Swiss-Prot record:
Belongs to the peptidase S8 family. The lineage of its organism: Eukaryota, Fungi, Dikarya, Ascomycota, Pezizomycotina. The keyword Metal-binding applies. Keywords: Calcium, Disulfide bond, Hydrolase, Metal-binding, Protease, Serine protease, Signal, Zymogen. The keyword Disulfide bond applies. Binds 2 calcium ions per subunit. Disulfide bonds join 34-123, 178-249. One of its GO terms (biological process) is proteolysis. Its cofactor is Ca(2+). One of its GO terms (molecular function) is metal ion binding. Ca(2+) 1 binds at residues 175, 177, 200. It comes from Parengyodontium album. The chain holds residues 106 to 384 of 384 of the full protein. This is Proteinase K. It comes from the Eukaryota. The gene is PROK.
Length: 279
């Protein structure tokens, strides 16, 4: 399948070269997979989700996304227009308040929630969790992300936006999960992206168009925006039978575009997520 005039980031993950605007993908489109978006919530009534999104948990007085961030991330995973895996099921877990903040104890609770909750959902092709959030190093936060991965969920996490070594941020620094940095439309590392030996992969993160609250759309930037590209890609590849939750991060790195990014510090991987789709 081909979607013309796609957002650049979707075009980039199905291309060997920058500078194109069509997204090419298998029509299966992540059907039968599930992606948890652990964030500020998801505006499930947004037409772009077509009834495929629902809120399953909140730790606040409401399950609604009063911020936008979670809706944007969810859109990049699985909206009709802006999403990687256009037929995936999206589940929202609201661990961040409407200011975008959350205590680590709540975040941990949300990750353990997903490890259990997947047993209540029909996801025959596999389960992914997308975590566009982080803060200073915490062994307890890393441990929770490791447990979620161990339970059979592909965990994708944002590297962080401090232009620093991700070793000092959590859950970015947990080795067993898939830590995602950000690139721009000219194949440069995004100027804010964290880096370091703990990164596994890069995805599009600068000027990413996706869904927003109030039934709207907007373009924003961050490792938060790269992460759902990789989460969506994992769901898409799992549906195709190419990989599993345990091995999807390694499979994505193995099949990535290699050596095409600039401003990659020495010791950081030069790997850009790629779907390897040949029509
Ligand atoms: Ca890793």
């Amino acid at each position: 399948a081909a979607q013309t005039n796609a957002p650049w980031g979707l075009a980039r993950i199905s291309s060997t070269s920058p500078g194109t605007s069509t997204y090419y993908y298998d029509e299966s489109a992540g059907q039968g997979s599930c992606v948890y978006v652990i964030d500020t919530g998801i505006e499930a009534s947004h037409p772009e989700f077509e009834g495929r999104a629902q809120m399953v948990k909140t730790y606040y007085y409401s399950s609604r996304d009063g911020n936008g961030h979670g809706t944007h991330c969810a859109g990049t995973v699985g909206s009709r227009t802006y999403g990687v895996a256009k037929k995936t099921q999206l589940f929202g877990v609201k661990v961040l308040d409407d200011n975008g903040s959350g205590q680590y104890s709540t975040i941990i609770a949300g990750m353990d929630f997903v490890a259990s909750d997947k047993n209540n959902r029909n996801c025959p092709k596999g389960v992914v969790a997308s975590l566009s959030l982080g803060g200073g190093y915490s062994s307890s936060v890393n441990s929770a992300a490791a447990r979620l991965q161990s339970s059979g969920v592909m965990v994708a996490v944002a590297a962080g936006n401090n232009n620093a070594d991700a070793r000092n941020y959590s859950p970015a620094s947990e080795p067993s999960v898939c830590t995602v940095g950000a690139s721009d439309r000219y194949d440069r590392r995004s100027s804010f992206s964290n880096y370091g030996s703990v990164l596994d992969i890069f995805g599009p993160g600068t000027d990413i168009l996706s869904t927003w609250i109030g039934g709207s759309t907007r373009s924003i930037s961050g490792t938060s925006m790269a992460t759902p590209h990789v989460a969506g890609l994992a769901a898409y590849l799992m549906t195709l039978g190419k990989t599993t939750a345990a091995s999807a991060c390694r499979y994505i790195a193995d099949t990535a575009n290699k050596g095409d990014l600039s401003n990659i510090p020495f010791g950081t991987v030069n790997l850009l997520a790629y779907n390897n789709y040949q029509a």
